[PDB]
Amino acid sequence: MPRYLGLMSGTSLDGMDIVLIEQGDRTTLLASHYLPMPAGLREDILALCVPGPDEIARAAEVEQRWVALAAQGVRELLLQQQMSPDEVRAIGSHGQTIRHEPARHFTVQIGNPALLAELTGIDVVADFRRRDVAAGGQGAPLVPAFHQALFGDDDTSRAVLNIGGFSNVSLLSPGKPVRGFDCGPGNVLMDAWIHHQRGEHFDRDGAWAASGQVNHALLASLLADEFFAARGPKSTGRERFNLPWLQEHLARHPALPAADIQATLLELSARSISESLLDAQPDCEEVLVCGGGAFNTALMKRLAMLMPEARVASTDEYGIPPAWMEGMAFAWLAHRFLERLPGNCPDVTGALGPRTLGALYPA
Amino acid sequence: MPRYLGLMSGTSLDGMDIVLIEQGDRTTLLASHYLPMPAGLREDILALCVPGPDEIARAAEVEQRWVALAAQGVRELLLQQQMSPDEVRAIGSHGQTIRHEPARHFTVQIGNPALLAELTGIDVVADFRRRDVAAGGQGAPLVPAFHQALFGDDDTSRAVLNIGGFSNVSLLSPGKPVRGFDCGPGNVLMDAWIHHQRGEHFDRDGAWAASGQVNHALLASLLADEFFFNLPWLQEHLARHPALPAADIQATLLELSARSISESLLDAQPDCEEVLVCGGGAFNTALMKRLAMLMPEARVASTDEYGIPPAWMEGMAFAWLAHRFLERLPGNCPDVTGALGPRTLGALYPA
Ligand SMILES: [Cl-]
Numbered sequence: 273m274p275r276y277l278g279l280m281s282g283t284s285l286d287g288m289d290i291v292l293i294e295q296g297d298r299t300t301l302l303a304s305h306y307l308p309m310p311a312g313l314r315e316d317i318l319a320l321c322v323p324g325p326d327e328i329a330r331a332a333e334v335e336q337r338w339v340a341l342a343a344q345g346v347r348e349l350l351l352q353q354q355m356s357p358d359e360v361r362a363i364g365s366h367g368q369t370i371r372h373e374p375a376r377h378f379t380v381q382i383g384n385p386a387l388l389a390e391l392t393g394i395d396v397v398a399d400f401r402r403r404d405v406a407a408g409g410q411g412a413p414l415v416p417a418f419h420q421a422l423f424g425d426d427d428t429s430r431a432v433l434n435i436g437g438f439s440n441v442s443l444l445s446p447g448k449p450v451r452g453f454d455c456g457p458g459n460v461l462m463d464a465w466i467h468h469q470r471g472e473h474f475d476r477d478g479a480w481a482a483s484g485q486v487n488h489a490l491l492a493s494l495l496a497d498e499f500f501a502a503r504g505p506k507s508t509g510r511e512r513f514n515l516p517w518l519q520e521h522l523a524r525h526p527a528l529p530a531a532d533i534q535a536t537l538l539e540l541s542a543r544s545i546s547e548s549l550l551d552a553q554p555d556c557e558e559v560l561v562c563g564g565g566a567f568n569t570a571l572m573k574r575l576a577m578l579m580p581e582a583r584v585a586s587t588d589e590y591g592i593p594p595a596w597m598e599g600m601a602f603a604w605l606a607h608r609f610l611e612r613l614p615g616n617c618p619d620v621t622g623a624l625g626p627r628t629l630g631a632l633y634p635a
Numbered sequence: 636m637p638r639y640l641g642l643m644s645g646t647s648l649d650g651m652d653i654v655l656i657e658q659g660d661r662t663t664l665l666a667s668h669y670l671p672m673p674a675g676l677r678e679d680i681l682a683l684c685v686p687g688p689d690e691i692a693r694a695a696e697v698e699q700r701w702v703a704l705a706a707q708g709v710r711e712l713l714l715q716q717q718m719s720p721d722e723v724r725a726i727g728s729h730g731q732t733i734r735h736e737p738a739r740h741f742t743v744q745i746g747n748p749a750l751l752a753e754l755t756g757i758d759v760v761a762d763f764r765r766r767d768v769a770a771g772g773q774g775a776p777l778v779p780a781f782h783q784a785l786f787g788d789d790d791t792s793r794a795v796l797n798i799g800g801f802s803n804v805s806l807l808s809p810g811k812p813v814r815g816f817d818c819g820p821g822n823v824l825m826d827a828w829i830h831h832q833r834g835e836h837f838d839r840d841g842a843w844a845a846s847g848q849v850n851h852a853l854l855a856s857l858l859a860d861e862f863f864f865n866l867p868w869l870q871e872h873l874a875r876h877p878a879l880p881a882a883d884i885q886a887t888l889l890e891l892s893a894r895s896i897s898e899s900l901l902d903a904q905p906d907c908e909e910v911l912v913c914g915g916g917a918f919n920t921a922l923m924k925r926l927a928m929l930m931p932e933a934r935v936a937s938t939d940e941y942g943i944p945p946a947w948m949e950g951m952a953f954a955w956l957a958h959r960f961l962e963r964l965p966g967n968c969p970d971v972t973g974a975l976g977p978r979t980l981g982a983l984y985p986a
């Protein structure tokens with residue numbers, strides 16, 4: 273049964289996930305491996321996420337460093353697992369998104385797959401989003417088909433919910449097509465605030481949020497954002513959720529304590545998920561939570577509250593650690609590419625139809 | 636007998652070349668197609684070849700336009716030839732280079748291969764240079780292996796010379812492995828000068844050059860470069876000596892290219908019976924005169940004489956490179972590129 277590596281750096285950017293799966297009758301996780309990303313690499317990536325000078329050269333240099341790190345992680349994992357590269361059929365590389373502009377019909381992942389193949393000695397499948405975009409799609413999210421393969425059940429209406437930077441839900445309804453969409457903010461505003469305020473990369477354990485007090489007025493002005501009304505195919509904020517967007521809202525209201533702002537941001541995520549989810553699937557029996565936000569104890573409470581009809585739990589309860597779900601999916605996408613099975617869900621992305629996603633860079 | 640399309644921007648960025656080959660026991664050219672490149676697109680590509688603002692967004696939009704054009708040409712060619720896309724195994728896409736810095740270990744060719752796959756319904760193999768550069772190579776030139784496969788001969792010592800911007804040669808000597816290097820400027824300076832002077836893209840048939848007179852003081856100053864190439868570099872050399880007629884500089888520029896070719900080529904392959912010229916410089920009658928004289932003991936002619944039109948050489952090589960990818964055969968000559976060893980070049984974007 274073939275083995276794959278999945279390689280990603282998400283939108284949180286503290287490091288690189290590497291997973292090893294076996295794709296037999298089902299997808300089995302064999303091993304996991306996390307590397308820290310140097311702070312400099314994280315900032316240089318974030319410096320490419322907004323328009324700037326000399327981007328071609330800058331991106332090429334950044335991408336060399338990102339690939340070097342990935343290959344390093346792959347080497348460490350294989351050695352530690354007593355495995356040779358020849359035991360791995362392919363790497364599925366998510367790359368690093370520096371610009372996602374589906375409305376301008378483009379998405380940009382860097383991560384020089386050719387150099388990744390050179391360094392690793394393993395075939396690499398990368399560049400998964402662009403075929404979806406070329407076919408009129410949003411290029412995202414790409415995890416629903418994997419989610420469906422993992423948790424596709426006729427006996428239960430399930431929502432698979434990834435809380436990364438942004439929140440995306442896969443709606444698995446018995447006797448129906450797979451639906452899904454980015455619900456909006458996950459950790460990203462909470463990351464942005466504690467970063468601006470104190471220089472921390474994220475709010476660990478949602479602790480600083482926990483200390484604060486939700487501001488019902490500010491929350492109402494955030495949830496007032498028209499974005500939430502937008503339905504159907506949607507990816508990574510139809511209103512780019514950022515700190516300039518937040519600060520604009522803050523000034524209008526009275527001066528609030530930072531901790532309260534953090535508590536409000538937490539409630540915003542909880543609320544926007546609940547309502548974007550139940551609106552599309554009121555029948556939801558189970559919410560399977562993955563991504564970093566699955567660790568946020570407070571956030572996980574509020575989801576359970578706001579969705580009383582559904583059982584809300586980490587994917588750990590269904591035998592898949594939440595930290596590794598996205599990487600496992602990119603390993604799976606490498607499999608789908610090699611088998612010429614469709615990677616996208618056209619009803620999720622809004623593409624014209626099913627497509628083979630990715631490109632093969634052979635070792 | 637698989638069939639492949641080869642795609643690339645043409646000479647002087649005035650259009651796109653598309654070729655259809657059959658890869659049997661040898662490479663056969665079935666058909667050729669040329670599409671003009673809009674002036675906007677040409678200038679927008681050139682505006683990305685130097686560092687500037689908002690490149691990632693600008694490059695995304697330019698490559699959408701470039702891929703739309705390529706696909707338009709593919710469609711035109713296939714209908715005109717009464718062929719289905721299902722008859723073509725793959726497109727080999729050269730893409731469009733906007734930045735080539737092997738010194739900094741990168742090379743950047745745009746051309747959204749997935750969009751091309753989407754629009755043509757044909758598998759695309761692209762991004763040929765990056766694996767060679769990943770392996771410590773220069774990522775160029777990639778045609779030596781093709782030239783060997785095409786015009787390899789046991790009896791004749793050949794030089795296959797491509798005169799694009801720069802003049803790269805493939806030295807085909809019986810019994811020996813293929814060699815290659817850049818002989819200095821091809822059309823790059825001659826295009827740059829008439830562009831600066833008159834806003835023309837190129838000097839057609841080297842007519843303007845042929846109206847002028849060579850300047851020794853300049854020619855010698857130019858040939859004194861330790862390489863033995865751009866507009867500022869030329870104007871620096873111009874400013875030393877006194878005012879000179881534009882046609883004479885253009886004449887001088889033409890001779891610089893001829894001499895650097897003649898001298899470098901004969902230096903590396905003294906026993907050169909035949910020089911097979913291809914690319915845009917092949918149609919520079921004036922330059923082809925001088926080359927014949929400055930290499931008197933060799934037969935100097937375009938690849939037309941040996942069965943393949945000089946215009947389509949490069950496109951045919953990229954179709955060939957799609958073949959090498961799918962067969963998992965090496966596409967580089969690591970002795971020419973400086974790569975660590977043989978590598979399969981490119982990446983497959985399936986329809
Ligand atoms: Cl995704």
Ligand SMILES: [Cl-]
Binds near residue numbers: 775776778
């Ligand atoms: Cl080349």
